[PDB]
């Protein structure tokens with residue numbers, strides 16, 4: 329009854345398991361390489377184990393040492409996005425449960441899909457270079473040889489040599505700094521991660537970083553020019569951590585720091601333990617995009633403690649995290665607000681299913697990533713279809729207080745483990761044993777394994793959404809002689825969240841007539857809003873409605889930041905608009921080399937370029 333991770337070429341957990349990584353490396357900005365040694369403490373799960381295989385991707389291996397002597401190893405042929413398997417011949421056959429240390433000397437490639445190297449010009453300060461990693465889902469193998477599967481969890485320690493003027497941070501507790509004895513122009517930063525983690529949660533950033541304390545267990549880190557704005561934007565972090573602890577149980581990770589990255593960071597956030605990474609596009613100036621922080625906080629339980637065993641079961645990570653996320657927002661801002669955000673999430677699920685197609689394999693909750701690059705499959709589906717299932721179960725099983733009881737018991741049960749959907753379902757049934765008749769009424773096969781929208785839509789309070797729908801419908805049904813009736817006062821009683829939902833509702837019916845869009849700018853002045861989510865949707869609405877004036881604005885947003893949620897749809901819209909098509913392609917070509925490697929790959933596919 330053993331499980332296989334079809335995204336990894338390494339030996340499975342049933343054969344051997346990495347227990348610890350000690351990384352010693354040096355960051356060479358001149359060569360854009362990370363060079364050093366990864367010492368893996370590995371425990372045999374088999375009798376008479378004589379070899380094992382590790383994942384690698386575009387790595388250069390110098391040597392492998394065990395027991396102080398070099399051993400034989402072989403790199404297999406590259407298997408596309410999975411990389412190349414590295415088979416290691418053990419000097420002495422191992423008995424079950426025996427542990428040894430394997431020290432591998434390696435160097436990364438400048439084109440490592442895990443890394444983005446930034447020139448000084450690409451940073452805020454314009455004087456120093458900058459490096460950051462992004463290992464999820466399967467890019468850790470592009471930094472170091474490892475069993476690159478979430479089915480294995482390990483602790484780690486690291487020593488990182490960097491230019492003395494720069495700072496290194498990792499997904500771990502800081503353990504001091506000293507000058508580098510082998511090069512006085514450099515400093516060594518040390519780190520300890522004492523809680524076992526999957527290797528996709530290993531993270532490294534190197535740059536001219538400064539910190540400010542914003543809570544009892546939270547520093548914000550960024551380049552100097554962003555520190556003050558970040559400190560204010562994320563000031564509710566400790567209050568959210570407090571609520572999360574109430575819902576999930578104790579926070580076991582020690583510190584909860586935030587790092588605000590350069591604009592090319594590909595996602596809204598990444599839940600790296602001890603150090604959440606976030607996009608600077610959260611800096612709206614009014615804390616309105618703070619749900620992303622609530623999301624990353626929640627991962628400290630769902631995802632980082634209870635982890636998906638393979639990426640086929642990613643919805644376990646994201647569905648429960650979004651569920652907890654929206655409860656944090658519900659406690660902060662009220663239950664009607666939780667329902668508003670939930671209903672918005674259904675709307676995002678609609679968009680994703682319509683984008684992929686209602687029969688597409690990636691619209692299933694549990695997917696099959698055999699021979700599929702995870703970055704290509706990545707979408708809102710596991711997030712929102714996952715949340716929808718949990719929200720549906722909440723309402724079926726007696727309400728939020730009852731289901732939050734399940735959530736906390738679930739985290740407790742599977743803490744420090746990696747699990748499948750069947751593990752989750754088995755415990756759901758165990759926990760709600762007295763309500764199995766209700767559980768047996770859900771169409772499990774449809775919810776878990778069928779494409780398309782779920783077989784049943786949950787009940788949503790409409791209170792906060794109603795004004796958004798009403799105004800969107802006024803615009804959509806408006807004829808030319810109705811345009812005069814619209815006025816800035818229309819927006820008087822709408823929050824930024826409601827303005828965003830108004831645009832989301834309207835974008836779902838785009839295009840609108842060009843004259844309507846021009847009137848919208850005339851009376852609402854949406855061009856003036858810097859809120860990234862609002863501006864994103866407004867610009868999409870403009871381009872899809874064929875307003876040439878918006879072309880430079882859309883091109884600017886698409887390139888001045890690199891969050892894929894924004895950059896990909898903007899480029900795709902610009903490509904589909906005949907007037908901007910050639911310029912969209914030219915702009916991608918010009919920027920490609922300086923984009924994040926994953927983002928460059930996906931925009932290229934989207935644009936059918938190269």
Ligand SMILES: NCC(=O)Nc1ccc(OCc2ccccc2)cc1
Nearest residue numbers: 464465595597598639642702705706
């Ligand atoms: N916030 C970073 C992040 O979520 N990145 C990431 C990158 C790739 C991933 O793909 C996983 C996957 C798993 C199932 C279905 C589609 C895609 C999942 C997550």
Ligand SMILES: [Yb+3]
Nearest residue numbers: 807808809810
């Ligand atoms: Yb009329």
Ligand SMILES: [Zn+2]
Nearest residue numbers: 623627646649
């Ligand atoms: Zn997440």
